[model samples]
Target: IVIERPNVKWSDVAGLEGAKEALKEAVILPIKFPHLFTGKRTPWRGILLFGPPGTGKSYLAKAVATEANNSTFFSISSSSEKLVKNLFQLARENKPSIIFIDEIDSLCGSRSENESEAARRIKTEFLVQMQGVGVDNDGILVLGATNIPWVLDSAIRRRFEKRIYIPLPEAHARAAMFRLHLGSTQNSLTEADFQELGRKTDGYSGADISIIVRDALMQPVRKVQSATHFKKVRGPSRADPNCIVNDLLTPCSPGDPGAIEMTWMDVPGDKLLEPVVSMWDMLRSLSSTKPTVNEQDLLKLKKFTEDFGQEG
Candidate 1:
């Protein structure tokens, strides 16, 4: 069956609000209003999305096509061995299409003599095919995604009239992510939960939160399996016949007098109740994970932008 369009609205994507807004204005809005922006004619020439992996760079490109009807999507890559053999054909087909090159740094880094013949040819051919002056197509949009923006060649970087940075989700974006991902779950969370989680995930990216939530949900099942194994070894009788009679005396477990009351399917007596992605989990994730863009990388990017970036 032809799958319906994906539900990746701009709001659904977490973080980088500035980049999202800019892309809408520079790419989507102009496409929608070609007549009004005679002075600001949307150049479908090229755009480069540079950021950490899994920050929804590719998703943003898909969102662009979805927002703009009558557009096609072509995903390109750095497999020079194959891309070189059919470069011309792919270029023709990709013309007037949004050509998305994920991890573009691998192919178009600073040129070196150590590069293979195919590598050299792929870059050369891409350069010749994509440039606006020699190309036959006018509305071909080249959108590139890369993790190592510093490695991209100066010329290739110049090809993109706009370079957008997709960074980690800040507090507000993290809050939005919790709402979006939690919508389909059986459990419901309050605004306080969202606010607390957001505050705790100060340095976390959208990808990180996805992982955190997934792991948190599976913890309950894991506990159940462990308890079943324990019961199997103990033959169920060792759990204590008095434990069954304890409800008449108190709700506490046999081992502890003041333990929290819980059913078998609920939290085990030995384990703390597994909360669903609370601020505590967020803090644990943050303590180990560092920001994707550290100071050193930021300095390097700032220098590159100052030297090479043009005014929009």
Candidate 2:
């Protein structure tokens, strides 16, 4: 029943080279080489990555299944202890697996445990790993991320021995996000152009980069959709290598050379084309997007990173 999930490689992960390695070591390393740290280390009980909301937390766990790979199972429920008990059961059945949780504070925040059996069992199952649960829990890694870090439960929090902050994608990562979103499509922009975007996107978050490029990519189609005119432009042939073709239709004013008045509806499917992704549209799209992280949330996350977590 799964449709399509991103088979994100570390390359697709444009940022968090540090956090990537930490996850690699914590999650994948033991599967390949458990004996490497048979000394005082256990194969990492729980890992918590916290960042601003839109920085793309979902991809981090998704990327692991490829490199070293995981039979990552999936969380958060209100059905009392049974839900927690069931997934824990499922994890042991699969053995080498991951439990991916996001917005973890919703279930495990610093709150009075005088309430739901669901919360208590979920907390206890996570707590179970510290004691008797450790024996059967060898291959299961609890991979979690949150937008709010300060709110995690103390009992649930310490179990996450490895903590890293997935900050807004860095300069390199922002550029790679552009390359990725624009992957293999005919683009007029070059690598340098994306890198320029990365730097200009100084305060922009990961999804900020993701969205801007997405908007840029769609410009050609939008041009085609609305235009009442077309101009033939010489561009690369789709099927013919080293051959330039003049059959491509680019949206343009009827006044331009070889311009013809026709709506997109009038164009045949095969002949219909939009201009290769243009650069001007990015700034226009940029108008709709802003750096997602607010300064208010950034500092609390920074303080947590300083106090406990490693740089990512």
Q: Which candidate's TM-score is highest?
A: 2
Put down candidate 2 lDDT per residue, 125-237, tens digits, no spaces. 65674455347745777777788877776666777888877778778887778778888887687777878777778888777777888888888888889998988667766
Which 10 consecutive residues of model 1 have the lowest summed lDDT?
A: 229-238
Expressed as tens digits, the lDDT of each residue in 1-312 for candidate 1 is: 111234467766777778878877666665565675455554647788877666778777767656645445556555426444353455456444455677788785453535556677767677777753545443456778876787766667778878888766669888787667767644446788788878876776677777666655554445444432221111112245333322221123236534443445553454332223444544454456554545666566666566566523
Report, for every candidate in turn, its global Cα lDDT versus the true structure: 0.60, 0.71
Clash count, candidate 1: 0
User: What's the count of clashing pairs in each model shown?
Assistant: 0, 1
Evaluated at residue 211, the lDDT of candidate 1 is: 69
Best of the candidates, lDDT: 2
What's model 2's TM-score? Answer: 0.85
